[PDB]
Amino acid sequence: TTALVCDNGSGLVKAGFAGDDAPRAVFPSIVGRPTLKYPIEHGIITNWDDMEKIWHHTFYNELRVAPEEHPTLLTEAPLNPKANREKMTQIMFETFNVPAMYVAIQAVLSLYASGRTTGIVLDSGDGVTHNVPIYEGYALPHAIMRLDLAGRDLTDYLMKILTERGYSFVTTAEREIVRDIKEKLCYVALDFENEMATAASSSSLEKSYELPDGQVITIGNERFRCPETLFQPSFIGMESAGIHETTYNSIMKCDIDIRKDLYANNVMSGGTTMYPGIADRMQKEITALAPSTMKIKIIAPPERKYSVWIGGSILASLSTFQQMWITKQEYDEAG
Amino acid sequence: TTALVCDNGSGLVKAGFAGDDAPRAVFPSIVGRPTLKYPIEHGIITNWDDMEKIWHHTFYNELRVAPEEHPTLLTEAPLNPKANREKMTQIMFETFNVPAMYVAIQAVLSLYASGRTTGIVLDSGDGVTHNVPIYEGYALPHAIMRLDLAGRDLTDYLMKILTERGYSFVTTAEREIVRDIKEKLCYVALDFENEMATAASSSSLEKSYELPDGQVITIGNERFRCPETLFQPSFIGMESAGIHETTYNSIMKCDIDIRKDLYANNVMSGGTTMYPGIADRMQKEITALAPSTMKIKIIAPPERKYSVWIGGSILASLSTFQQMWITKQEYDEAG
Ligand SMILES: Nc1ncnc2c1ncn2[C@@H]1O[C@H](COP(=O)(O)OP(=O)(O)OP(=O)(O)O)[C@@H](O)[C@H]1O
Ligand SMILES: Nc1ncnc2c1ncn2[C@@H]1O[C@H](COP(=O)(O)OP(=O)(O)OP(=O)(O)O)[C@@H](O)[C@H]1O
Ligand SMILES: C/C1=C/C(=O)O[C@@H]2C[C@@H](CC[C@H](C)C=CC=CCC1)O[C@@](O)([C@@H]1CSC(=O)N1)C2
Ligand SMILES: C/C1=C/C(=O)O[C@@H]2C[C@@H](CC[C@H](C)C=CC=CCC1)O[C@@](O)([C@@H]1CSC(=O)N1)C2
Numbered sequence: 177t178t179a180l181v182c183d184n185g186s187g188l189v190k191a192g193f194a195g196d197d198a199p200r201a202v203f204p205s206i207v208g209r210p211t212l213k214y215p216i217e218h219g220i221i222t223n224w225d226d227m228e229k230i231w232h233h234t235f236y237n238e239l240r241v242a243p244e245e246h247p248t249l250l251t252e253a254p255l256n257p258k259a260n261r262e263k264m265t266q267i268m269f270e271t272f273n274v275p276a277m278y279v280a281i282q283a284v285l286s287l288y289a290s291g292r293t294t295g296i297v298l299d300s301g302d303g304v305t306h307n308v309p310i311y312e313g314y315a316l317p318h319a320i321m322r323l324d325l326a327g328r329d330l331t332d333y334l335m336k337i338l339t340e341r342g343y344s345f346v347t348t349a350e351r352e353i354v355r356d357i358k359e360k361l362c363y364v365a366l367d368f369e370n371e372m373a374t375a376a377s378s379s380s381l382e383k384s385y386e387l388p389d390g391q392v393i394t395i396g397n398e399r400f401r402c403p404e405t406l407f408q409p410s411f412i413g414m415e416s417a418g419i420h421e422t423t424y425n426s427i428m429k430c431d432i433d434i435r436k437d438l439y440a441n442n443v444m445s446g447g448t449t450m451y452p453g454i455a456d457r458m459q460k461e462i463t464a465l466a467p468s469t470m471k472i473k474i475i476a477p478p479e480r481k482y483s484v485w486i487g488g489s490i491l492a493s494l495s496t497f498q499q500m501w502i503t504k505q506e507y508d509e510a511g
Numbered sequence: 512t513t514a515l516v517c518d519n520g521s522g523l524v525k526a527g528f529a530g531d532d533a534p535r536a537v538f539p540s541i542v543g544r545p546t547l548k549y550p551i552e553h554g555i556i557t558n559w560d561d562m563e564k565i566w567h568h569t570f571y572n573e574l575r576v577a578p579e580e581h582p583t584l585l586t587e588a589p590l591n592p593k594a595n596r597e598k599m600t601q602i603m604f605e606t607f608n609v610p611a612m613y614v615a616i617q618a619v620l621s622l623y624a625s626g627r628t629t630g631i632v633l634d635s636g637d638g639v640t641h642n643v644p645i646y647e648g649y650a651l652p653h654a655i656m657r658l659d660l661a662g663r664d665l666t667d668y669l670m671k672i673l674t675e676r677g678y679s680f681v682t683t684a685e686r687e688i689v690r691d692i693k694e695k696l697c698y699v700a701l702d703f704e705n706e707m708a709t710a711a712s713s714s715s716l717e718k719s720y721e722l723p724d725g726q727v728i729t730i731g732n733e734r735f736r737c738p739e740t741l742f743q744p745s746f747i748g749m750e751s752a753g754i755h756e757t758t759y760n761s762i763m764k765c766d767i768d769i770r771k772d773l774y775a776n777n778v779m780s781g782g783t784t785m786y787p788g789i790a791d792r793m794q795k796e797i798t799a800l801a802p803s804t805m806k807i808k809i810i811a812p813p814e815r816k817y818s819v820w821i822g823g824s825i826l827a828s829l830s831t832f833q834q835m836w837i838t839k840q841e842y843d844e845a846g
């Protein structure tokens with residue numbers, strides 16, 4: 177009788193029940209095979225047999241529930257292929273015997289989580305980053321921007337820029353330690369030059385970090401150079417535009433009537449948007465690219481690591497959404 | 512048993528019951544379709560399927576009455592085509608099953624609202640402006656003047672002349688805010704030059720306006736330059752004559768016997784004639800174009816936004832009008 181909510185990400189899987197304040201299970205999207213394998217790449221499901229192993233683990237190992245006794249709400253990256261979605265549905269009704277289910281757009285859920293039907297979302301995960309403009313609940317597809325740059329790319333870059341300081345983070349076990357640092361110490365510098373100049377002249381921006389084996393290490397400008405890649409992807413050999421630019425482009429690809437409201441509603445989702453000082457930066461950067469008379473506003477909610485999941489827990493619980501489910505009868509009938 | 516009164520305008524629909532002091536329902540003449548659509552353009556019905564949706568909303572959503580249980584009084588712009596009127600009647604007797612109905616000339620009703628049978632009306636709405644000379648209740652058709660310039664054109668012009676001051680009113684949602692300003696602050700300058708000179712030298716004619724989002728803005732000469740378009744339509748690329756001129760022309764196109772009485776009875780109807788200082792202007796301007804010995808007088812009633820509706824509420828209630836109804840029997844007989 178209780179509905180579920182399964183947010184499948186490139187890095188993590190955030191699962192729980194609809195109506196809850198937060199997901200009860202949060203675990204890696206991996207499958208070890210000597211060795212590990214991420215079945216979701218850039219927010220898209222690449223291996224299906226593996227993906228079933230994840231959903232199987234979700235229901236039975238994590239949530240400890242019968243999948244046929246609960247309607248399940250699955251999530252999907254924006255502009256997800258139709259053959260990709262139809263393949264999910266099939267697996268839920270046939271392999272996991274679900275009584276009903278539905279596939280919602282991750283970014284759209286994050287908007288609802290904020291309490292908004294209309295707005296331009298920025299969802300940066302571990303595998304992919306998206307600019308999704310939404311009007312009256314419908315995400316405008318021709319305006320959506322994609323960017324294959326997220327936390328994992330950022331974690332890798334940090335490892336690299338720590339290697340020039342004399343450190344040796346190469347193995348995958350060590351990569352997690354560099355992820356922890358990235359999450360713990362890093363921040364988004366309001367101005368890059370000014371900050372680098374503070375780092376060159378003083379040691380005020382330096383921070384100590386205790387490694388698993390007790391030893392302490394220090395990091396200076398890496399704190400903000402790493403997340404800077406988001407605004408300048410060319411730092412890692414990417415000729416793509418920054419997040420401020422792709423956000424601007426996204427808005428300009430919409431109708432002129434809604435732009436005022438998109439600018440005024442810049443929601444931020446995904447753990448990669450958790451960098452301290454990212455809101456002050458996106459305000460600054462956007463303000464410049466856009467007109468002078470435009471009111472810009474960035475909304476960065478404290479629990480934006482789980483805005484997608486929270487968005488589905490609300491949606492699943494809504495009265496208006498109940499009709500939009502897909503019963504096994506409907507599927508076994510209409511396909 | 513109670514009669515209705517439905518004033519259909521290009522911008523608004525003013526509906527209510529006959530005998531009432533004012534209409535109970537006042538709503539936009541729009542139909543959204545992703546987006547909005549004004550079925551009445553320049554006071555004339557262009558889309559009939561939409562217009563039915565408006566009348567349907569009027570009866571059932573707004574007035575909450577059965578159309579077959581009440582005789583309905585509909586309004587029409589002057590010089591409305593006969594095929595236009597015959598199409599209205601058909602829709603009322605056949606689609607809305609009315610027991611009776613009648614189609615009256617908007618401007619003529621406004622005259623009755625003032626308490627006059629003979630006089631030259633000026634009715635400026637949101638979509639069209641008309642000079643209608645009326646004698647003993649009959650509006651003289653060959654003398655009627657039309658002008659495709661009203662509040663909406665005026666609202667658009669104001670947006671434009673606010674853009675030179677540095678503001679950015681472009682979208683349709685913002686257009687309503689510029690309409691509010693137009694209605695709130697604007698006025699008709701007795702003399703244009705003198706006023707512009709006051710604006711160039713001092714800041715006494717400036718007025719602050721609180722925008723929906725709290726921020727305040729200032730407007731100076733736009734207050735009177737916007738409504739000035741009425742006296743000089745060339746401001747917006749219209750080679751047509753002003754309202755003072757078309758009013759003069761209208762009077763000269765009549766018989767010489769009634770001119771004295773037309774001049775002495777210049778009634779003003781429609782929301783566009785609500786600009787403060789428009790009466791002092793029309794007096795001045797007309798006085799000049801006309802002879803010296805002529806007694807000019809402008810009548811601008813406080814409730815002239817609803818003079819057309821009020822005119823029909825009185826007419827529907829009159830004893831002499833009762834015979835002029837059109838019974839469904841009469842129609843289903845004579846067509
Ligand atoms: N405080 C933090 N600062 C910066 N990054 C963080 C922080 N906490 C978590 N992250 C990063 O956020 C990412 C996880 O976010 P999320 O779970 O939304 O992504 P995902 O759903 O796994 O992948 P995607 O959404 O791209 O498919 C990881 O890369 C993680 O390192
Ligand atoms: N105080 C005001 N000053 C100036 N204009 C006003 C004021 N109040 C309303 N208006 C304008 O008057 C118009 C509405 O008047 P009205 O309802 O008579 O027109 P309509 O019947 O919708 O159109 P039409 O009569 O031309 O077919 C709108 O353009 C509105 O902006
Ligand atoms: C607290 C935590 C958060 C997380 O997001 O991990 C996810 C999942 C993780 C799987 C592989 C590692 C060894 C196993 C385990 C771990 C537990 C989850 C770790 O691979 C990431 O680290 C990658 C690599 S580096 C990066 O940025 N993304 C993202
Ligand atoms: C208080 C009010 C008066 C009015 O007259 O509105 C009418 C109707 C309105 C319909 C479209 C808007 C968005 C929706 C709603 C509104 C409520 C009615 C607003 O479009 C006008 O604004 C046009 C545009 S600008 C102008 O001058 N005429 C005239």
Ligand SMILES: [Ca+2]
Pocket residue numbers: 184185186282301446484
């Ligand atoms: Ca995600």
Ligand SMILES: [Ca+2]
Pocket residue numbers: 519520521617636781819
């Ligand atoms: Ca009217």
